[PDB]
Amino acid sequence: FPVVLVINCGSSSIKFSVLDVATCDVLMAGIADGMNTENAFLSINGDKPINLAHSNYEDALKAIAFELEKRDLTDSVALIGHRIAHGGELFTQSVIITDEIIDNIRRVSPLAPLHNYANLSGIDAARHLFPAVRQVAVFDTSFHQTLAPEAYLYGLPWEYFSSLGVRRYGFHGTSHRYVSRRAYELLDLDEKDSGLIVAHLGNGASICAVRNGQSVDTSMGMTPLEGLMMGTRSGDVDFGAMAWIAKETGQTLSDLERVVNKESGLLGISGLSSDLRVLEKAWHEGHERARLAIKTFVHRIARHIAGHAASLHRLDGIIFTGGIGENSVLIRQLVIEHLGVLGLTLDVEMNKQPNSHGERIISANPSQVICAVIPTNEEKMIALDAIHLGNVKA
Amino acid sequence: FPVVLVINCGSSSIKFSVLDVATCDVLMAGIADGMNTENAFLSINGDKPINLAHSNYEDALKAIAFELEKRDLTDSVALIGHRIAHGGELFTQSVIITDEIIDNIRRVSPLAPLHNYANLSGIDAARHLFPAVRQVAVFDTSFHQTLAPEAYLYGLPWEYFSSLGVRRYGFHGTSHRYVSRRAYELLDLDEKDSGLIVAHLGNGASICAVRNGQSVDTSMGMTPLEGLMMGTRSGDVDFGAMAWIAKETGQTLSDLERVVNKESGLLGISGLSSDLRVLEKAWHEGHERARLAIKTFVHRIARHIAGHAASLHRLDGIIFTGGIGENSVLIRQLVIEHLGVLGLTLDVEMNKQPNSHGERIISANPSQVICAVIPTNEEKMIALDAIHLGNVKA
Numbered sequence A, B: 001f002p003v004v005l006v007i008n009c010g011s012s013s014i015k016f017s018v019l020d021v022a023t024c025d026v027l028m029a030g031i032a033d034g035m036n037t038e039n040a041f042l043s044i045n046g047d048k049p050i051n052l053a054h055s056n057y058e059d060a061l062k063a064i065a066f067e068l069e070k071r072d073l074t075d076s077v078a079l080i081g082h083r084i085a086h087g088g089e090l091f092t093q094s095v096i097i098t099d100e101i102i103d104n105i106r107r108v109s110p111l112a113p114l115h116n117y118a119n120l121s122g123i124d125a126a127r128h129l130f131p132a133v134r135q136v137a138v139f140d141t142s143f144h145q146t147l148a149p150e151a152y153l154y155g156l157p158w159e160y161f162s163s164l165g166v167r168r169y170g171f172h173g174t175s176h177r178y179v180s181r182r183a184y185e186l187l188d189l190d191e192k193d194s195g196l197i198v199a200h201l202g203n204g205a206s207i208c209a210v211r212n213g214q215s216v217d218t219s220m221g222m223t224p225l226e227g228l229m230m231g232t233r234s235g236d237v238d239f240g241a242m243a244w245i246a247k248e249t250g251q252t253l254s255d256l257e258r259v260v261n262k263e264s265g266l267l268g269i270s271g272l273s274s275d276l277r278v279l280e281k282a283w284h285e286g287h288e289r290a291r292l293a294i295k296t297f298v299h300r301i302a303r304h305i306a307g308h309a310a311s312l313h314r315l316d317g318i319i320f321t322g323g324i325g326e327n328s329v330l331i332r333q334l335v336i337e338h339l340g341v342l343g344l345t346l347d348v349e350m351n352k353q354p355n356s357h358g359e360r361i362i363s364a365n366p367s368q369v370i371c372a373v374i375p376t377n378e379e380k381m382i383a384l385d386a387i388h389l390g391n392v393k394a
Ligand SMILES: Nc1nc2c(ncn2[C@@H]2O[C@H](COP(=O)(O)OP(=O)(O)OP(=O)(O)O)[C@@H](O)[C@H]2O)c(=O)[nH]1
Pocket: A201, A202, A203, A204, A205, A231, A274, A275, A276, A277, A278, A280, A322, A323, A324, A327, A328, A329
């Protein structure tokens, strides 16, 4: 009974999961938080949170590996999946990790300095601790590589694209891809003759237009900062405004980068929280700035959904996913009502149902476009890629 | 037979027009270019281009005033209209210019340092040369003041909006308003139950959603830099990308501001021209980068049109206007074809007709949304506001 070890090695943490090869069920999950600081702690699926003083990525993954030994799962690890944040233009699909792949990730690493160097550290660690195990790289950008130049070029001088690689890459590719496949089943659509809009909504939020199985437009850009307004991220912001603030307040680009990434968004407007649950209660309790933050959030999602629809020949489905897209009765209601122009009709009893109801259609029959909620499973999509690449003779 | 003198006092030029009060026909037009430099020249509607060595806004407007004396039009100037670029939050409509209005324009002037201080210079000049004449201020921003907070707030910290005035203002308001009114007649729509998308397309380009007579969304932001890709302007650009370029190339915000405003857009991608006529011929002649510039241009327009449709309850019309929107058979074709998802059907024989055909519907009967071209007349809209305010007892 073989298993897959999925690793998301972030800048401050290491998210891991162990999935059974046969059924793709989660058998174990956890997180190693506070990475590189004096206080680094390992936590396993809600159980006892252990500790490690000033531990790096290699020893933290070794701590996780010790726990796989304890539950006799080490010998069963047949495949390892790595989430990589940025794959540049080089990666269009998931790959078996070799010396070539490592070099290529290093080549595109300047495009995401925070995310990617942590991913490489996770690769080296897993390579050290599991040398006889096939390892797979799954990229957040790869699904969006089917974008046409008209859809990925910025209006900048050509030089920036040709010599520096400045262009739209987009993210949540694993999720957008996973949720796309599930939508063809749920909505009984032909993949080769379909038009979908996936609204991945969480702490990070992005929209994707999936035409005939392929991503044709996405809301995030070169960095995860473009598009929708998010938890702490601003989203689409007038550069003229950003330059105006720079002169007026006397702030540098790196100061504003911090503000736009960690002090903005839902947090920025409300002045209260980046968490929707807190903000939803706040609005119910008559908080005005929380109402505005959520309304602006909703408005920018509706705008990007409708905008990405333009890249489709025909709109068959709108799919909600992510922590917010799966669990927010209100946000889904407000977004769909904001898109009445497209002929959407919501079924509120179906929209009331909690996420325990899993893959569910939330639109009424007279609606021109089917609306649904599909719980995203990024770990399953990584595992499925690994299992596929497990049959490959290298 | 009274006349109206319309003045657009830009940073490098002074565009003027003389319109008859009764019919609103143009009787005289011209431009005073190269303002403040050693070489400043007055040109009148294609006729002999006179000169003036190192002339300021006051003397240049006096040169224009001398020509009004020559053609015996000075005594007939009953009203003067001023185009103002930025009216902040203070101006929701056109006003009779008084000491209060001047102060208020000065108050909001930091929001547009280039545009507004030139507008004030034009006001002072016209006040000096025509003291007994009623003068009117028409603002580029005022039509967009009906925007809801959800539509004008950025995802920045609240402080930037509350204390600094950072928010979406939008521009081309005079044009968007003018073209809106004309569309109700042409499309036989009830103003109070209508949904329009106006695509003002020129060297500067913006989209506006006009719901029930009011602007509810617009593509430009705090500055004219946000939204669509334009002639020399980039449009929507990932700030993360802008910050990345800053570190990599070693450029300041003011360097990048120049690049994004004057070296980007259609010029930036093609590396050839900001003019569409040149680029359209270039593509016909097999130029690849000109094809890409136009395709990216088209894609970003389609995306914003469809996006702004979300702010409408029902989409009755899409209206093209501006130098490009009025004269580009190709761009209109490519944009409408890019919006097939909305159920648009183009009539190509009707779309082939040149601008001499004026206000014209270009969509076929089976189309779900009426498409039209309405020639914009910003001078007429300024004159009509002035004539209205001419009946006002102050
Ligand atoms: N309304 C509501 N919101 C919820 C609920 N549960 C979680 N959320 C929201 O979901 C968000 C977190 O979602 P996640 O998908 O886990 O965010 P993330 O994984 O850090 O971000 P991404 O990896 O980019 O998707 C938080 O901001 C919560 O406010 C819920 O039960 N109701």
